[PDB]
């Protein structure tokens, strides 16, 4: 299947409260595996998955030195942006970056990412062609011009097609067994009183991994869309996810409704109803 290596980077200025806070977070196929956090005396790149612990001291050293370098580049970038937008020196600002590669089953690069945001808004992004930039506004056009002359796209293309692809392979040899983890949802229906002759049926999906899931309610072979309540998928905090979908139904008609649970760990979707306890 397809695989990805992406770094989510954040630099947050805090005028008077100290130096900007800098973070580098690595993800292999949506799972955090490494982290650098500047908010420390001797800050260091750290493993966030046990399969990364096997990398030797030279690896951790190189990544730490490189992250401290990037940190210093973003500290300058924060001052450069205040100028570009004509902002005062005493307000807190954010720079965020998503950088990385998506590779297919055949090892070829599917997508390269180099996306910047300033104060939570698109700033500049490398286009799919890996040759041109999309500047969101006037300030980003200054960056686009500078990077066009310096041949930045070409330098990034070399990283995305080379280093990124190659390092994703290395990380996958280490983490693949753990990364392919699939925990099927365990589902149950709860019953709750409503005013008058109505009741709520809440269909629960628990202990599942990955987070992608679909819960539906059916009545007379048709999926209920309007009047169906749901919660956004949420972490249990132990590595698994939770979700629920509920519907308001007539009292006495609980057995006419079926909940369906769709997940990658489910060859057959779960079908369940309200089961009144003994």
């Amino acid at each position: 299947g397809p695989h990805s290596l992406r770094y989510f980077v954040t630099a947050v200025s805090r005028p008077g409260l100290g130096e900007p806070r800098y973070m580098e977070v690595g993800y292999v196929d949506d799972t955090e595996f490494v982290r650098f956090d500047s908010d420390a005396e001797n800050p260091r790149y750290e493993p966030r998955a046990r399969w990364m612990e096997q990398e030797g001291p030279e690896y951790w050293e190189r990544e730490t030195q490189k992250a401290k370098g990037n940190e210093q580049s973003f500290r300058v970038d924060l001052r450069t942006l205040l100028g570009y937008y004509n902002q005062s020196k005493g307000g807190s600002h954010t720079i965020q970056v998503i950088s990385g590669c998506e590779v297919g089953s055949d090892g070829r690069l599917l997508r390269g990412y180099q996306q910047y945001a300033y104060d939570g808004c698109d700033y500049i992004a490398l286009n799919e062609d890996l040759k041109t930039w999309t500047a969101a506004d006037m300030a980003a056009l200054i960056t686009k011009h500078k990077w066009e002359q310096a041949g930045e796209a070409e330098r990034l293309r070399a990283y995305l097609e080379g280093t990124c692809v190659e390092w994703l392979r290395r990380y996958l040899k280490n983490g693949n067994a753990t990364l392919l983890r699939t925990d099927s949802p365990k589902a149950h229906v709860t019953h709750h009183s409503r005013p008058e002759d109505k009741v709520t049926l809440r269909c629960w999906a628990l202990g599942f991994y990955p987070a992608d899931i679909t819960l539906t309610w059916q009545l007379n072979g048709e999926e209920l869309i309007q009047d169906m309540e749901l919660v956004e998928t949420r972490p249990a905090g132990d590595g698994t996810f939770q979700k629920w979908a509920s519907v308001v139904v007539p009292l006495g008609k609980e057995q006419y409704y079926t909940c369906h649970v769709y997940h990658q760990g489910l060859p057959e979707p779960l079908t369940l109803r309200w089961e009144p306890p003994p």
């Binding site: 770094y7 980077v9 580098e24 690595g26 990544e63 490189k66 992250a67 370098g69 990037n70 580049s73 973003f74 300058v76 970038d77 450069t80 942006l81 720079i95 970056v97 950088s99 180099q114 910047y116 700033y123 500049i124 960056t143 500078k146 990077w147 310096a150 930045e152 330098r155 990034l156 990283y159 280093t163 990124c164 390092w167």
Partner: peptide, 8 residues
């Protein structure tokens, strides 16, 4: 391995 970012 993270890229070495260029200044904006």
């Amino acid at each position: 391995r993270a890229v070495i970012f260029a200044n904006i």
